[PDB]
């Protein structure tokens, strides 16, 4: 059986440097051809690197010419990517194929931002709602933290269906999370809801509790 | 160069269903090595068609590659309900990739559906920051295909909306979140905010008067 990991992705500063590394396995690296692709967060597929097998010609995309470099440690039967002047545009999910892609290794988030920060809870209430469905929809806005993840529940545990909780969106080197609970016009607010938000790296925990508008 | 393909498709399970790949600089030929492959939900790839035609060892007959026309396509015979997935064509211009935009495939496993839009005005916790996030929450929509456009005052917001990635809930229907960012001045400069939720021919929206 084949099988490829990368690893080596991590936060890093606009301008710095990281080297990215696919260690194979079920095959000799010297004859196969190995490419570098990325997954944009706007879910596009962009091509970065191709070296071929032998011993043979290493091809850039033009995003990437002179910043990027590629190699191989066919004795550890290794594949490397150096990342050099990290600029915005590159925060991705960098993956490895084998010839003609028909083998994909699992990724590695490499993200090129600012700083660490605790999130920033916001309660979200409906204003001067009405009940369509006797259903009304409160939520709670997870802003500005760095870096992921997060964990986002409702009257921990209590409120399980009903709960949309909706993926990250990066904007100013931050990330900006939502989430909610659909509850009968029974429940809120003759009883309350509080979503219970923890930004596990930075060991924070708050608790929001939605109050009428 | 550029490759093109088409935004998304849909089919009923049973069905063939061809998808295609264009190379804006002519003809798409076997010297472009024409190549397939699929990304299944929490970003999975395994490449389906190489050189134009072969089909890599694995994968199942129902995928088939070929050119027709001065395109490439793929052509699934007898579509089945998991591959509803994002298929991704890429095309070697003898010296680099270039890779197409994806094709978002349904095969209705279940009918038709509409979305669930809401739209929550901003927090005074946060408008007291100077920040003015309205959120809106687009639930329940199957295919999973949205376009959100926002307006404020009639005028479309232009800018500082960001929408999400549909993702499946576990009814394997889908769920989106936009958001508009404006000061808590330019908020209130504006009396009127509308998100707009467009879904299979069918806008739906939602609003809020702020004065
Ligand atoms: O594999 C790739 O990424 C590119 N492939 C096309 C393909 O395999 O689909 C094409 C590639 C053939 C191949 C080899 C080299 C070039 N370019 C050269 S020599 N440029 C010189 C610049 O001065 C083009 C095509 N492979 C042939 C094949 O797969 O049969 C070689 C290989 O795979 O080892
Ligand atoms: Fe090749």
């Known amino acids: 059986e084949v099988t490829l990991v990368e690893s080596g992705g991590d936060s890093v500063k606009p301008g710095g440097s990281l080297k990215l590394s696919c260690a194979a396995s079920?095959?000799?690296?010297?004859?196969?051809?190995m490419s570098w692709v990325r997954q944009t967060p706007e879910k596009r597929l962009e091509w970065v690197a191709t070296?071929?097998?032998?011993?043979?010609?290493?091809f850039y995309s033009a995003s990437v010419k002179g910043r990027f470099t590629i190699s191989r440690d066919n004795a550890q039967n290794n594949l490397y990517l150096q990342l050099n002047s990290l600029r915005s545009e590159d925060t991705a999910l960098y993956f490895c194929?084998?010839?003609?892609?028909?083998?994909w290794g699992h990724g590695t988030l490499v993200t090129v931002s600012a700083k660490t920060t605790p999130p920033s809870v916001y309660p979200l209430a409906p204003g001067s709602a009405a009940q369509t469905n006797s259903m009304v929809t409160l939520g709670c806005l997870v802003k500005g933290y760095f870096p992921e993840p997060v964990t986002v529940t409702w009257n921990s545990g209590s409120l399980s269906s009903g709960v949309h909780t909706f993926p990250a969106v990066l904007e100013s080197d931050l990330y900006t999370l939502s989430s909610s609970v659909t509850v009968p016009s029974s429940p809120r607010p003759s009883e309350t809801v509080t979503c219970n938000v923890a930004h596990p790296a930075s060991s924070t925990k708050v608790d929001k509790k939605i109050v009428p508008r | 160069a550029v490759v093109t393909q088409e935004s998304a498709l849909t089919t009923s399970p049973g069905e063939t269903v061809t998808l295609t790949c264009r190379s804006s600089?002519?003809?798409?030929?076997?010297?472009?090595?024409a190549n397939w492959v699929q990304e299944k939900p929490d970003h999975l790839f395994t490449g389906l068609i190489g050189?134009?035609?072969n089909r890599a060892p694995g994968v199942p007959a129902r995928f088939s590659g070929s050119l027709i026309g001065d395109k490439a396509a793929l052509t699934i015979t007898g579509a089945q309900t998991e591959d509803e997935a994002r298929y991704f064509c890429?095309?070697?211009?003898?010296?680099?990739?270039?890779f197409g935009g994806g094709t978002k495939l349904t095969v209705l496993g279940q009918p038709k559906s509409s979305p669930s839009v809401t739209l929550f005005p901003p927090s005074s916790e946060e408008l007291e920051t100077n920040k003015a996030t309205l959120v809106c929450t687009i639930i329940d929509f199957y295919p999973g295909v949205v376009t959100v456009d926002w307006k404020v005052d009639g005028t479309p917001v232009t800018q500082g909306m960001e929408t999400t990635q549909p993702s499946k809930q576990s009814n394997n229907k889908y769920m989106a979140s936009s958001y508009l960012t404006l000061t808590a001045r330019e908020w209130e400069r504006h009396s009127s905010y509308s998100c707009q939720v467009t879904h299979e021919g069918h806008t739906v929206e939602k609003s809020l008067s702020r004065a």
């Open positions: 194929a084998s010839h003609r892609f028909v083998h």
């Open positions: 079920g095959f000799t690296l010297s004859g196969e051809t």
């Open positions: 070296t071929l097998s032998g011993g043979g010609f290493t």
């Open positions: 600089t002519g003809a798409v030929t076997t010297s472009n090595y």
């Open positions: 050189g134009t035609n």
């Open positions: 890429a095309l070697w211009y003898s010296n680099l990739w270039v």
